[PDB]
Amino acid sequence: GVIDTSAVESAITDGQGDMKAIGGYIVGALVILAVAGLIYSMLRKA
């Protein structure tokens, strides 16, 4: 479970890499909320 097992594990990390990239949406959620708050503050100042 080291030879073809290592290749299968590498293929699963590359394929399971889609879920980590998608989860990046939740992390960018705080940045989107901060940008929306900054836009609301700029609109209130204007």
Next chain:
Amino acid sequence: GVIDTSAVESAITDGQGDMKAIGGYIVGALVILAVAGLIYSMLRKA
């Protein structure tokens, strides 16, 4: 208990693999709580 025993043990790990995958819900519980806290912080900032 090594010949057909090894095949039975492999079949049980593959079938018992459903419980380990389901338990992944408890592990993703911390990530869901962190995402909810980040969303609440973004809503409070907005």
Next chain:
Amino acid sequence: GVIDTSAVESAITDGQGDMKAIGGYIVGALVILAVAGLIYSMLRKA
């Protein structure tokens, strides 16, 4: 005590297998405590 004795020993292990499966509750006790601690940490963060 090898012929019918081996069959009686196999029947006792299969019947006494219920106590080993039940003891699995104590082992899953640490996992349940870890899940409860993770849920409490997520609630505190939220």
Next chain:
Amino acid sequence: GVIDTSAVESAITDGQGDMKAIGGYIVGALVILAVAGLIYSMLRKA
């Protein structure tokens, strides 16, 4: 100490389960403190 002993151990865990449920108050103590801190922060912001 396996037959009626197992039933006595199961009855003691079910009865001793009251102390584990009560201890849940100490774990919910951190969540209550976090909720009180959030309420104090909201009152200060208001």
Next chain:
Amino acid sequence: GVIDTSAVESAITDGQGDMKAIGGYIVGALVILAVAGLIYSMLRKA
């Protein structure tokens, strides 16, 4: 030392069971310290 000896050994374990129950105070010492640390963290957050 098997007949009345077994009854004397059982009586000594039941009587010596008080020391094992009392020692439970030292084990609950870690839980009390964790509860005190959680209460101090909640007070600091408040």
Next chain:
Amino acid sequence: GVIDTSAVESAITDGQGDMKAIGGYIVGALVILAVAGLIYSMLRKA
């Protein structure tokens, strides 16, 4: 060292309990620092 030994150990824990209660001052140090920081923030806001 179980009979009068247990009573001596219980007396030492009750007497050595003064050091654990005194150490509570270091734990309440974080709460005192948080209260001082909150008072300084309130004075700066005023």
Next chain:
Amino acid sequence: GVIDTSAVESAITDGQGDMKAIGGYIVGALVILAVAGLIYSMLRKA
């Protein structure tokens, strides 16, 4: 049972070496669980 017996024992260890290599999956189970816990902690931090 030393001449052809030694060759038969060597052939059995080489053939029975498949079961030891397969058992390596259970040992790599702890490493996989540690990697999953590290990934969950990184996702919670993000």
Next chain:
Amino acid sequence: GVIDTSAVESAITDGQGDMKAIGGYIVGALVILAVAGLIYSMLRKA
């Protein structure tokens, strides 16, 4: 199994050293997650 056996064991550790170096990706996973969290926090602050 000490003469040419030691050379074969040394060659296997040098060749099996590729799997330990590759596993370094999982260890650097926590550092990558911490860097992503720091970048997200910096973007939210900006």
Next chain:
Amino acid sequence: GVIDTSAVESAITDGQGDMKAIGGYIVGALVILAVAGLIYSMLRKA
């Protein structure tokens, strides 16, 4: 080496008890480091 030997062993444990009490300084080293870290965190918060 059981009569006066037991009294000599008891006297050596009572006299060698000074080294175990002194070693308590190394154990209290972790508590002192934790108290210093808590004081530094409180000073940074203030």
Next chain:
Amino acid sequence: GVIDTSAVESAITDGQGDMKAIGGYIVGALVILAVAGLIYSMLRKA
């Protein structure tokens, strides 16, 4: 693996010290983000 092995390990840490120094860029990423946020706040105030 202690004589020339220690010199080889020291040479690898000195050479592998380039990767730790380079990783310092990710740590200085938070400071750069804080400086950019402070510059943006100063520009908004002006």
Next chain:
Amino acid sequence: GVIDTSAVESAITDGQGDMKAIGGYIVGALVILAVAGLIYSMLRKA
């Protein structure tokens, strides 16, 4: 290595106590950074 050994160990801790006191500079580094940030915030407010 218990008699004069204990005195030598006590002398080394008292002499090696200079390095622990000096390391206190790194711990007071966070307090100095917090004081500098508070002074910069007060200057910006003025």
Next chain:
Amino acid sequence: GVIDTSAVESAITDGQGDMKAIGGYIVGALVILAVAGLIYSMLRKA
């Protein structure tokens, strides 16, 4: 191997004491990383 053998073993521990002192660099690695993280946090706060 007890007379001159003990003196040779003592000389080897004193000479091999250089490797234990050098290994102290890896242990001080965690303290250096913590100091760098504290300096980065202080710079971000400033």
Next chain:
Amino acid sequence: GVIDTSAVESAITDGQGDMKAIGGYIVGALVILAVAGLIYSMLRKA
């Protein structure tokens, strides 16, 4: 097999001492893994 036999046994232990010194690499494997884990934790903290 005691005269020249003892000299041959001493020569074999001195020559076979290379394999024990080389095996020291496997023992230092745990220390290298602990150092790598400490470096990864320091990088994650930074």
Next chain:
Amino acid sequence: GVIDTSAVESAITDGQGDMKAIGGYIVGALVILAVAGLIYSMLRKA
């Protein structure tokens, strides 16, 4: 070899007692390593 032999054996154990006391340094090696690890953890926390 029982009369003056017993006195010679007692004198050899008292004289050979120096090697057992010196070996106490290797046993105290684990305690010294644990104290160094605790000091490093306290420095990292500070």
